[PDB]
Ligand binder design. Structure first.
Ligand SMILES: [Mg+2]
Ligand SMILES: [Mg+2]
Ligand SMILES: [Mg+2]
Ligand SMILES: [Mg+2]
Ligand SMILES: [Mg+2]
Ligand SMILES: [Mg+2]
Ligand SMILES: [Mg+2]
Ligand SMILES: [Mg+2]
Ligand SMILES: [Mg+2]
Ligand SMILES: [Zn+2]
Lengths: 144, 113, 211, 114, 100, 82
RNA sequence: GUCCGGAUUGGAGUCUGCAACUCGACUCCAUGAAGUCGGAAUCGCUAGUAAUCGUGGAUCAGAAUGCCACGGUGAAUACGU
């Protein structure tokens, strides 16, 4: 957008929890438009996360992403005429996506034989501010 | 006799401004040429400079990256070759600096073909 | 840049085809071959009748050819003799019962084919081209044309370097599909080389679709 | 366990562990198994020798392991001996079946050489 | 192209049509099951005695106005070039620029 | 492979030449262009000068060559290296 | 380096075609390279898009990983110049 700053479109709630954030999560996790595989993975991971965290699995997802959501991040600027880093705050809608993105990549790196398990394990460690998802969040805060 | 003036301070004068042939006493011919300041090589292609360094043919095709610029690209054979002293460090640095010099003198849009 | 053929793009909107028969893929190719050679034969034979277009329509057992000429009495000769002769000829080429029905063009100065071939006939007679094109455009618009553009390309006046010369007057809106823009191309072979002329003649927007 | 031929099969589904032998692949393996009556999902461990000997008997019918290696080597050696086109391309070390050799014939020429 | 090429094409077709019946019958005898291998042998020997330019697989569709051996279109029998002229001039019936 | 229902292939001019050669005894190398024909059992021990496209190279037929085309023994490209 | 990967090669075939040696496509059995996400650098894409999944057509006896078309599933992001 040089001329028209177009508004973002709306995502549809998930048919299992009506949660916009869950739908955004599965859209981020999706690969090659295979939505069904992604929803299977996410529901499996959420339910096992529920088993470890007891009640309120959707809420557990909320607090998991909360424990690793970023507040301040470095941003590049060429106004000086040379590359210039600056610490800037992040809008809530964007830090939601950043947290979701960091979670999914971290899960893929985890391995251990199943995406369902990787996602659940990363979420479970995220719920308690651990699993290296928080560490990646902590390092980009330190870079302020 | 050819004109001969002594140098002053950092560099010498340009006495001989001509190129003259002279018949060698025993056999053959020599040619006196005017002094030069910059023998820059922007007309030459960058590959022709790698060919010009004769101590580099011993390592062509030994770099894992085929388009190996040989400066810091991984697996540059001549890099390690100069690490162990097979190649003259000064020669490697000169090669790099004349390459980067060609970038400075490529500003002109005139043609050299 | 290049421009789409004006006649070829207005076929759906304002221009009728010049061969309106129907046939399935079994004998489509040879129909085209036969009609191509017959119309080229007619052009070669009526190089003086000043023909503009040779439309061809085929009944299942017959071939019907309609000539658009500016000199009807010429092509029909005397008592329709030569027209019957060439009807026999097209019967030979098509191998099919033939019928020829000539048609006249009332404003020969309003026919891109006619004016283009006239320009070329002048050029090959070694006349200064600017005179030719400007006379053509003046005549056309004197006969009430909404616009006309003439274009000549080649070794004009035996030039060592070929130049492009055009001359427009009136309105010639190529981009408007609704426009009745008649276009045709001719070539003149001189000692220096071959010179190409193109003629656009815009006769008015045709409101109300094809019909 | 031990099966005919020098190689020792590992402990996994029979159809798969049988492929270890040089002369047997997935279809020939299930053929051998069906002929011996042993199912596929069985493992090589937990499989009494009473059927192991039957397996080796049925694999004895087909050419396998070293004898196959010698047979293919004789066939290529014969090809080279004729002096036929394929023989030449075999002793030259080049694609034999008409593949493009102007580029990307590496599988038979080895790594790029200067 | 060169007149030689168009002449070659017309000769090839004028021989293929001639020997069509014989070639068909002979190929029948050859591929025919239950055929005595001596009859099949005589047929496969006789087949190569016919002019090699009798096999239809040996012809090449050329532009029916220029003889161009490339960009051919069976529906019209012209190369990819002359089809465009005929179309833009309104000679190919019902042919127009497509858009969808 | 050609087929089995059609049997091997050979052009009959080579067939006539080879039968007239064998029935007549030892002969000069047969000068043929038919790279497409296949070696039959009867032509064993013969010598065929088969065209490589610029020259007829000699090929001394052995029983091992049976079941193969003649062209397989007349390379058509010269190459030595770079 | 696997029940990944399928290259390569041996053996045996089918079909088209006068004719598959050079030099076709395909099938079967066998074989199972490199390859474990790719340096500097660089490309495409703002929504039914990218990504992914197949299907068809032209040319054409035969010979598509190309081309031209068709639908299925179907995102992320855009503060700003
Ligand atoms: Mg300047
Ligand atoms: Mg255009
Ligand atoms: Mg297999
Ligand atoms: Mg010509
Ligand atoms: Mg062909
Ligand atoms: Mg596999
Ligand atoms: Mg393997
Ligand atoms: Mg792995
Ligand atoms: Mg699609
Ligand atoms: Zn290097």
């Amino acid at each position: 957008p040089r001329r028209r700053v177009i508004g973002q479109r709306k995502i549809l709630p998930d048919p299992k929890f009506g949660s916009e954030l869950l739908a955004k999560f599965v859209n981020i996790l999706m690969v090659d438009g295979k939505k069904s595989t992604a929803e299977s993975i996410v529901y499996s991971a959420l339910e096992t996360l529920a088993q470890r965290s007891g009640k309120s699995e959707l809420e557990a997802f909320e607090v998991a992403l909360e424990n690793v959501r970023p507040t301040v991040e470095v941003k590049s600027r060429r106004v000086g005429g040379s590359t210039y880093q600056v610490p800037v705050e992040v809008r809530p809608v964007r830090r939601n996506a950043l947290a979701m993105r960091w979670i999914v990549e971290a899960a893929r790196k985890r391995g251990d034989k199943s995406m369902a398990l990787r996602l659940a394990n990363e979420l479970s460690d995220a719920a308690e501010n651990k699993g290296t998802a928080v560490k990646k969040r902590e390092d980009v805060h330190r870079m302020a | 006799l050819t004109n001969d003036i002594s140098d002053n301070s950092g560099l010498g004068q340009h006495t001989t401004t001509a190129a003259r042939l002279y018949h060698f006493p025993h056999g053959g011919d020599v040619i006196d040429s005017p002094g030069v300041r910059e023998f820059g090589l922007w007309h030459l292609e960058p590959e022709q400079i790698t060919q010009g360094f004769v101590e580099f043919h011993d390592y062509l095709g030994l770099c894992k990256y085929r388009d190996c610029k040989h400066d810091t690209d991984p697996g540059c054979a001549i890099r390690e070759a100069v690490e162990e002293g097979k190649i003259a460090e000064t020669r490697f640095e000169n090669y790099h600096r004349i390459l980067e010099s060609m970038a400075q003198v490529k500003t002109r849009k005139n043609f050299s073909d | 840049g290049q421009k789409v053929h004006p006649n070829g793009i207005r076929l759906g909107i304002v221009k009728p085809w010049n061969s309106t028969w129907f046939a399935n893929t079994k004998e489509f190719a040879d129909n085209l071959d036969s009609d191509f050679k017959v119309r080229q034969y007619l052009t070669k034979e009526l190089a003086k009748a000043s023909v503009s277009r040779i439309v061809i329509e085929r009944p299942a057992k017959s071939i019907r050819v309609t000539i658009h000429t500016a000199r009807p009495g010429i092509v029909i000769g005397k008592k329709g003799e030569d027209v019957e002769k060439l009807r026999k000829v097209v019967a030979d080429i098509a191998g099919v019962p033939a019928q020829i029905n000539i048609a006249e063009v009332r404003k020969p100065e309003l026919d891109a084919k006619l004016v283009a071939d006239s320009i070329t006939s002048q050029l090959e007679r070694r006349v200064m081209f600017r005179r030719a094109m400007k006379r053509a455009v003046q005549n056309a618009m004197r006969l009430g044309a909404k616009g006309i553009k003439v274009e000549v390309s080649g070794r004009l006046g035996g030039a060592e370097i070929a130049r492009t010369e055009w001359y427009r007057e009136g309105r010639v809106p190529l981009h408007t599909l609704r426009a009745d823009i008649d276009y045709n191309t001719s070539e003149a072979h001189t000692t220096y080389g071959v010179i190409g002329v193109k003629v656009w003649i815009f006769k008015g927007e045709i409101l109300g679709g094809m019909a | 366990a031990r099966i005919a031929g020098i190689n020792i099969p590992d402990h996994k589904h029979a159809v798969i562990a049988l492929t270890s032998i040089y002369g047997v692949g997935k279809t020939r393996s299930k053929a051998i198994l069906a002929a011996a009556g042993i199912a596929e999902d069985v493992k090589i461990s937990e499989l009494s020798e009473g059927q192991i000997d039957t397996l080796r008997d049925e694999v004895a019918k087909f050419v396998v392991e070293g004898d196959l290696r010698r047979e293919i080597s004789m066939s290529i050696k014969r090809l080279m001996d004729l002096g036929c086109y394929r023989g030449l391309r075999h002793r030259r070390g080049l694609p034999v079946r008409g593949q493009r050799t102007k580029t990307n014939a590496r599988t038979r020429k080895g790594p790029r050489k200067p | 192209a060169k007149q030689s090429m168009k002449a070659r094409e017309v000769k090839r077709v004028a021989l293929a049509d001639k020997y069509f019946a014989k070639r068909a019958e002979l190929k029948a005898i050859i591929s025919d099951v239950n055929a005595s291998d001596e009859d099949r042998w005589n047929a496969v020997l006789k087949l190569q005695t016919l002019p090699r330019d009798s096999s239809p697989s040996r012809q090449r569709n050329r532009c029916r106005q220029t003889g161009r051996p490339h960009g051919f279109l069976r529906k019209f029998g012209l190369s990819r070039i002359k089809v465009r002229e005929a179309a833009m001039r309104g000679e190919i019936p019902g042919l127009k620029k497509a858009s969808w | 492979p050609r087929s089995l229902k059609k049997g091997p292939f050979i052009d009959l001019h080579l067939l006539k030449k080879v039968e007239k050669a064998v029935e007549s005894g030892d002969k000069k190398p047969l000068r043929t262009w038919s790279r497409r024909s296949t070696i039959f059992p009867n032509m064993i021990g013969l010598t065929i000068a088969v065209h490589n496209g610029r020259q007829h190279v000699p090929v001394f037929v052995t029983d091992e060559m049976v079941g193969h085309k003649l062209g397989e023994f007349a390379p058509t490209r010269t190459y030595r290296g770079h």
